[PDB]
Design a protein around this ligand. Structure first.
Ligand code: LMT
Ligand code: BR
Ligand code: CA
Ligand code: CA
Ligand code: CL
Length: 328
């Protein structure tokens, strides 16, 4: 039993949270059942996925409003069964015509697909277009879109079956892996992760960032003209890193994190998980500037997974709880 010592470090079981406060944080009214991932367009519209397992939804906020309200986007089309819609990570892709595609990881039962929608702005609706599935996408956590049906995806596990996933995680196999998917060409691009989770890309398309939750790492890969990834750098932290957002103006990373892994994996309302947001600047330079921008123990926001910024505001989502909107 030094599978006790691996467990304590992986799940960061001793960590407590030094508070870092922001001025003027408000809970978003109407978000009570998760807001695991979100993405903000250049014009300030924000998509949020919720009700990850209280049915599954995609929410919309217009972050240009002074006190933004959430509305539920209506999904239309006949290619999607909503009664099992169970959305997880998301990504957007804006084509040359300014069509907005939204890609949504979906877990209908114990399975993964990637659902492609077209966002219809004037109507506040999502036109379902395509269900994607593949043997190289067994357990999809998050994707980053590089076209309407092109993305890199993390699998947080090698197995699909929850019983096996549980064994796979506790054994510490680290078999999780990252897939490039496109209509003509589906390949594994990186492998051997302990719970690969968030994933994103630099604004110029040359670097890919991947969060490895249980190793407390962000990997930086050079992304090449042929879509292949090569390892460049690994950053280490004292926290479980979950989803990565990238600010398109600076390239900075905004990361939602779980300080203590026991509290997010073995939920307990008497000891609920806290929240933490990191900002990472100059991730290529010799000393990347890492800053804790917001941190608390869960008396306001529990289980942060994602954070992004828009024009001076910070929006933070969680696995199964609320969302917080804050001034920086
Ligand atoms: C990565 O590659 C994979 O990772 C782990 C260690 O990381 C290896 O070994 C693993 O298996 C055994 C069970 O048999 C575990 O108790 C051990 O703690 C674990 O480290 C696997 O043999 C290998 O398949
Ligand atoms: Br915590
Ligand atoms: Ca995402
Ligand atoms: Ca995630
Ligand atoms: Cl399986």
């Amino acid at each position: 039993d030094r599978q006790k010592s691996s467990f304590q470090t992986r799940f960061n079981v001793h960590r407590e949270v030094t508070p870092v406060e922001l001025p003027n944080c408000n809970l978003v009214k109407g978000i009570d059942n998760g807001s695991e991932d979100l993405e903000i367009l250049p014009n300030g519209l924000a998509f949020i996925s919720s009700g990850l397992k209280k049915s599954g939804k995609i929410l919309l906020m217009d972050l240009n409003e002074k006190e933004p309200a959430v509305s539920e986007l209506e999904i239309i089309g006949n290619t999607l069964d909503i009664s099992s819609f169970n959305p997880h990570g998301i990504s957007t892709f804006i084509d040359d015509d300014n069509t907005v595609y939204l890609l949504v990881v979906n877990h209908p039962g114990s399975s993964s697909t990637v659902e492609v929608f077209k966002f219809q702005e004037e109507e506040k609706s999502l036109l379902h277009l395509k269900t994607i599935r593949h043997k190289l996408l067994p357990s999809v956590n998050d994707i980053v879109a590089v076209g309407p049906e092109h993305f890199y995806a993390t699998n947080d596990h090698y197995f699909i079956d929850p019983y096996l996933q549980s064994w796979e995680m506790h054994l510490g196999l680290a078999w999780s892996f990252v897939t490039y998917y496109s209509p003509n060409d589906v390949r594994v691009v990186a492998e051997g992760f302990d719970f690969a989770n968030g994933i994103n890309i630099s604004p110029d398309g040359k670097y890919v960032y991947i969060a490895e939750l249980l190793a407390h790492k962000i990997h930086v890969y050079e992304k090449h003209a042929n879509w292949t990834l090569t390892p460049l750098k690994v950053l280490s932290f004292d926290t479980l890193v979950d989803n990565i957002s990238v600010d398109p103006v600076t390239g900075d990373l905004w990361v939602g994190c779980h300080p203590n892994g026991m509290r997010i994996f073995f939920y307990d309302a008497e000891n609920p998980p806290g929240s933490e947001v990191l900002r990472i600047q100059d991730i290529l330079s010799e000393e990347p500037k890492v800053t804790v921008v917001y941190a608390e123990n869960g008396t306001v926001l529990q289980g942060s997974t994602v954070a992004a910024v828009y024009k001076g505001k910070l929006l933070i989502g969680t696995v199964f709880h609320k969302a917080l909107y804050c001034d920086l």
